[PDB]
Each structure stands twice: as structure tokens, then as C-alpha cells.
């Protein structure tokens, strides 16, 4: 990680080496707890990953993006658990994801006891420890996405927290991070989420479009510079 921070990767480097560097820095910041940038980088690398070859590469990248996502609360898409070249290889991680989405500590414990060798084999046993300890945050994430407001007693009932104060503490920790946007009203008990203001007339589309058009302009300029006429 320290070497990465003081080393700037060349932009002209070939696609596969760029994908390798992206994978390496993504693993570094995933075990370094920079989960958002981690998932962004592995999604980029998979976009740069070869479609046909690099089966082992795509398998490791898929495994680490799965764990990074569900650590952040995001559920990996089922289709990546369906291609023949990845199905049985992610079958341990597929059962992992099944336990994570179900969230039952019994099946979770049985899955851990059955696949811990695979979990450490990728250097993710500590990662799956944090996974086992972030499944609750994931649960709170879908709870808050579904409900605009919810009493902490209802939180404890739907999440099996056994205490309103425990629910308060856990939801406060979860809302500290950028997982849930809300406005807690302890006068009455509201978890009233922020008003979903119109994305248009909010300058956000302007910024996203500015970034995208800058990307297209750089692509066009680099293309027009790379015409490379021959001498004869």
C-alpha cells in the first residue's frame, strides 16, 4: 500500500497490465478497508478483464468483489454465479452468498465450518470474518431501503436484535457510514429518510455529464492524435 501511494501508474500501459495493477491495488485497499474504491476498481478491472481467458483471474476477482460488495451491503448479481466457467468454482462462494443473503447464523456457521479452507485459501478468512460481522449492517441496509421510517422495536423484531437500545446503537453505527441517509427524530422515534429531491434541477446531472463529456473529448483527442500516417 505504501509503495502504491507514491507510485503513479502510466496511463499508456497496456490493457492487461492495467487490469493487473487495478486488481492489486483493489485487493490492497480491500484488505485496507477502502471498500467503495475497492469495488469501483474491481468493477473497472472486470470490464478490462479478458472475456475468454484468465479464468483464474476472473474467478479470484469475482470472489473478492463478492466479499467486498456484501461487506458494503451490495448483493452480487446471480448471473455471475451461472456461467459454466465460474459456476462450480464459485460454488463455495455461491453457498457463502446464499448464507449471507439468508442471514441465519446456523446456516452461516455450517457454511463457515464447511468452506473455511476455501475462505482462507484466497486470503479472505479475515475478510469473511468482517463479512460475518457486516451481514447485520447489510440487513439494516435493505430494511432502510424498504422502509422510509421504522421504529427501533420493529428493527429489533425484523432483525432479531432483542433490544431497542441495541437496535439504536447498531442503526447509529450503520447510518454513520454512507449506507443509509436519514434524519433520526428522537422526539417521536422517526428514522425519517432525507427527502428524495428531484435529481434534475439539482446540478448532479450537470456534473455527471461534465465528467462523461470530458471522457468523450479525451477519447476523441487521443484518437485523432493516434492517426499515425506512414511515410510512404
Amino acid at each position: 500500500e505504501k509503495l502504491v501511494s507514491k507510485s503513479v501508474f502510466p496511463e499508456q500501459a497496456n490493457n492487461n497490465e492495467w487490469a493487473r495493477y487495478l486488481y492489486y491495488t483493489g485487493r490492497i485497499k480491500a484488505i485496507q478497508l477502502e471498500y467503495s474504491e475497492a469495488r469501483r476498481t474491481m468493477t473497472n478491472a472486470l470490464r478490462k478483464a479478458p472475456q475468454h481467458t484468465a479464468v483464474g483471474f476472473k474467478q479470484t476477482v469475482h470472489k473478492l468483489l463478492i466479499v467486498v460488495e456484501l461487506l458494503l451491503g451490495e448483493i452480487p448479481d446471480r448471473l455471475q454465479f451461472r456461467q459454466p466457467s465460474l459456476k462450480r468454482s464459485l460454488m463455495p462462494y455461491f453457498l457463502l452468498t446464499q448464507a449471507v443473503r439468508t442471514g441465519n447464523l446456523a446456516k452461516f456457521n455450517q457454511v463457515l465450518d464447511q468452506f473455511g479452507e476455501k475462505f482462507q485459501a484466497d486470503g479472505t478468512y479475515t475478510l469473511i470474518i468482517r463479512l460475518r460481522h457486516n451481514v447485520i449492517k447489510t440487513g439494516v441496509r435493505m430494511i432502510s431501503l424498504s422502509y422510509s421510517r421504522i421504529s427501533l422495536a420493529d428493527i429489533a423484531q425484523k432483525l432479531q436484535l432483542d433490544s431497542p437500545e441495541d437496535a439504536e446503537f447498531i442503526v447509529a453505527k450503520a447510518i454513520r457510514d454512507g449506507v443509509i441517509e436519514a434524519s433520526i427524530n428522537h422526539e417521536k422515534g422517526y428514522v425519517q429518510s432525507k427527502e428524495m429531491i428531484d435529481i434534475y434541477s439539482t446540478r448532479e446531472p450537470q456534473l455527471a455529464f461534465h465528467q462523461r463529456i470530458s471522457f468523450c473529448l479525451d477519447i476523441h483527442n487521443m484518437s485523432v492524435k493516434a492517426m499515425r500516417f506512414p511515410p510512404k
Binding site: 428522537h186 463529456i213 473529448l217 476523441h220
Partner: protein
Amino acid sequence: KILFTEATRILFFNTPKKMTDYAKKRGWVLGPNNYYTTIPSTELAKQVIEYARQLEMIV
């Protein structure tokens, strides 16, 4: 806004005086009843001027 009593309860400062000192140590204040944009038109203008620049000045 968070009430004096519940704040003292959840701030884990068993001495209410300790809770008050830790409250003054921060800017998070007691409250009266014990109950604790524009069009910048410059950076975006720079952006559109930059777009025009990338259209002009040849390759």
C-alpha cells in the same frame, strides 16, 4: 436534537459533571430546553470554455 437526560444516559459519563465537561470540550451544546444552492457560473463556465477549447485549436 438530543435531550439532556438521555444524552447523559448514553454518553457513558456516569458523572453528569463529566458529561458536561465532555460536552463543553466539543461544540455540541446543551440547547435551551435541556435538548441538545446557487449557479456558480464560473467552474461550469470554465467547463464549457474547456469544451470549446477541445473543439477548437486543431488536434
